[PDB]
Amino acid sequence: GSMRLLVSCVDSGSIKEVLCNIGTDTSVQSALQPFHVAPHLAEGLKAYVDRMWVISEDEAILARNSGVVELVKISKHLKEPKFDISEFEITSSVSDLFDDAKLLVDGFVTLCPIKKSNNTFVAATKSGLLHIIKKGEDKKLIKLASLGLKAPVEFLQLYDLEDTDTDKYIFAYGGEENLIKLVEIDSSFQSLKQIWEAKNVKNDRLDMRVPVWPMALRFLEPSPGKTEKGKLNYQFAAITRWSHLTKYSTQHGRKPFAQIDLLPNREPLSQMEVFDAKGENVVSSLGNFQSETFNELNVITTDYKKNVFKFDGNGRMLGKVGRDDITGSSTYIHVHDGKYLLQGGLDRYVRIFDIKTNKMLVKVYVGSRINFIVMLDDVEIE
Numbered sequence: 001g002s003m004r005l006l007v008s009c010v011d012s013g014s015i016k017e018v019l020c021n022i023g024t025d026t027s028v029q030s031a032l033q034p035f036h037v038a039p040h041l042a043e044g045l046k047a048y049v050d051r052m053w054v055i056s057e058d059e060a061i062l063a064r065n066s067g068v069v070e071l072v073k074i075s076k077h078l079k080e081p082k083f084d085i086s087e088f089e090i091t092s093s094v095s096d097l098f099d100d101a102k103l104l105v106d107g108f109v110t111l112c113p114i115k116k117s118n119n120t121f122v123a124a125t126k127s128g129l130l131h132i133i134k135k136g137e138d139k140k141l142i143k144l145a146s147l148g149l150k151a152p153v154e155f156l157q158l159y160d161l162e163d164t165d166t167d168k169y170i171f172a173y174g175g176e177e178n179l180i181k182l183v184e185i186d187s188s189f190q191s192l193k194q195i196w197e198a199k200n201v202k203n204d205r206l207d208m209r210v211p212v213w214p215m216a217l218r219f220l221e222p223s224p225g226k227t228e229k230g231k232l233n234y235q236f237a238a239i240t241r242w243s244h245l246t247k248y249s250t251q252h253g254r255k256p257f258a259q260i261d262l263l264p265n266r267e268p269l270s271q272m273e274v275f276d277a278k279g280e281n282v283v284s285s286l287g288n289f290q291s292e293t294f295n296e297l298n299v300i301t302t303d304y305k306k307n308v309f310k311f312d313g314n315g316r317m318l319g320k321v322g323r324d325d326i327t328g329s330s331t332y333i334h335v336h337d338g339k340y341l342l343q344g345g346l347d348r349y350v351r352i353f354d355i356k357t358n359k360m361l362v363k364v365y366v367g368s369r370i371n372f373i374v375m376l377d378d379v380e381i382e
Contacts, residue, residue, distance in 0.1 A: 002035055002083070002379040003362065005342075006060075007350050008049040008332075008372035013064070014042035015049060017086050018350060018364050019379055025363040027349070034364050036079060040088045041072070051111035052374050053121065060374075063108035063123050067098035069133060071141050082382045092140040094133055102127035102151040110156040115164050116285040120144070120189075124156035126175070132189040145189045152176050154241075154270075157217045159234070160284045172236060174198075174214040180238060180248070196232055199254040210259070213241035216272035218299070221292040223251045237294065237313070239272045239301050245315050247294055260315035263303070273300040273335040275310075277318075279356035281338030300341065302330040308343065321353055325360060331371045344370030 001021040009016050018037050025031035047066035054060045062070045071092045076084040098106040110124040119135040128151035132144040149156075154175035167187050174180035182196035201210050220235035227233050232250040240246060243266050247258040262269065274289045275298050276282045282290055289297055297313035300321065308330045310318040321341060322330075328346030336342050340361075341353040346369050352362035 002381065003352070004086075004376040004379050005350060005352075005362075006052065006086075006374045006376065007344065007366055007370055008052065009039070009366055009368035010048040010371050011045060011368040012039065012042045013044045013046065013048040014368075015040045015052075015062075015088070016366055018366070019083070019085070020362055020364060022361045025360070026365045027363060035081070035083065036085055037364070037366070038085065040086070041070075041090065049372055050108035052372055053111050053113070054374050054376065057377055061111060061121060063097075063111040065107055067096060067106070069094045069097060069111070069121075069123050069131070069141065071135060083379050092135075094131075094141050094143050097123060097129065097131055097146075098125055099127040099129060104152075109153055110158075112158060112286055114158060114169060114185075114189075115160055122156070122158065122171075124149075124153065124173070126153050127151050128153050130156065130185075130192075147185070147189075147192055149173060149183070150178055150181070152178060154213075154215045155217055157219065157288075158286050159219050159288065160286045161219055161221050161288050161290060170195075170234070172217050172219070174217070174238070176213050176241070177211070178214075179212055180214050180217065180236075182232070182234065182250075196234075196250055197254065198248065198256070201256060201259050211242050214238045214246070215241050215270045216301070218272055218274050219288040220294065220297070221290065223249050224292050227251060235292065235294070237272075237297060237299070239269050239299070241268045241270070242266045243269055245299075245311060245313075247313070262301075262309075262311055262315050262317070268304055269301050269309075270304070271300070271302045271333055273333055273341075274298070275300055275335045275341075275355055276338060277356070279339040279354070283335070283338070287335075300333055300335065302333060302345075304329050306330065306347075308333060308341075319358065321358060322351065322360060325363070326351070331369065332373060334373065336375050340375065342373040342375060344373050 005018040020034035051063045073089045123131045128149035130147040152175040156173040159170040180198040217238040222233040245260045294313040308321040331345035334342045343351040
């Protein structure tokens with residue numbers, strides 16, 4: 001340590017840099033306190049950061065709720081115990097990326113490379129736009145395409161679990177009453193085709209339709225063993241806004257092979273982070289689970305109250321994270337490098353937890369609602 005975090009502070013539409021050791025808790029007088037907190041790139045509530053992607057210690061991409069994607073140069077400067085702090089410069093942008101009449105307002109749901117020599121990124125919207133943007137040879141961002149999907153979209157997840165040399169790009173997406181779909185995008189990024197669409201489960205024991213609202217999805221590796229022709233071979237699991245864990249295997253068909261009620265009374269959920277109970281790093285760059293077996297899946301998800309829940313692949317609640325500390329909806333969670341949970345939401349504290357022990361390692365007040373956090377390399381200090 002110290003850790004170097006960047007935190008999306010929605011209320012000022014800014015990013016804060018936070019530097020601090022393990023053991024920091026700003027709410028506890030006796031505890032370590034952050035060495036540094038400072039504001040950057042404040043664009044106001046109208047233009048808060050939806051997502052970030054760190055390209056390197058010198059560069060990141062931001063996707064903002066103004067409908068703008070920004071390329072950002074990160075630099076280092078001695079703070080005037082000695083250490084460097086960051087400064088940020090937007091070097092290029094792409095604007096006009098939303099379509100709020102598709103139809104609640106629009107936002108970016110995905111910002112990531114398309115795949116792990118490559119300079120090309122996807123930025124996907126709730127309105128069902130899939131933008132493909134590259135950092136060109138001239139160092140500036142250029143939009144390559146804007147492809148349309150079926151709105152509304154809660155998530156768009158790329159598949160990256162086989163290899164990187166095969167000319168195929170696959171993703172899944174879905175949203176409110178919008179069944180999960182698999183799509184193949186041609187490597188020109190100019191055309192797409194839908195290859196699979198989920199079906200709903202049967203009506204329930206009271207002969208009532210079970211509503212459809214997938215919120216998040218993570219792939220698994222393909223089903224093992226012999227495969228049939230004419231069926232695709234993708235496995236994936238999703239969390240729904242009606243409190244389901246849904247498990248799919250396209251070799252089985254379009255219906256889920258299981259749909260499990262995670263909490264009583266349809267308690268709404270969002271987010272889905274794969275993790276290993278020992279803190280091992282078992283996921284791809286994009287968060288997909290590098291296993292063919294659902295029995296080994298464990299996920300972290302959130303309600304809209306204050307809870308952060310851990311579940312196994314059978315829907316058993318393994319425990320909460322931050323039960324007695326988190327007091328508002330946990331808008332953002334992310335499992336980082338297997339071992340850490342990054343957390344931040346309506347209660348205005350950035351937190352870091354240890355996955356294996358469930359211990360709170362860092363708690364820093366940032367004076368804003370939080371919707372995104374990244375952990376950069378550790379800070380060299382003298």
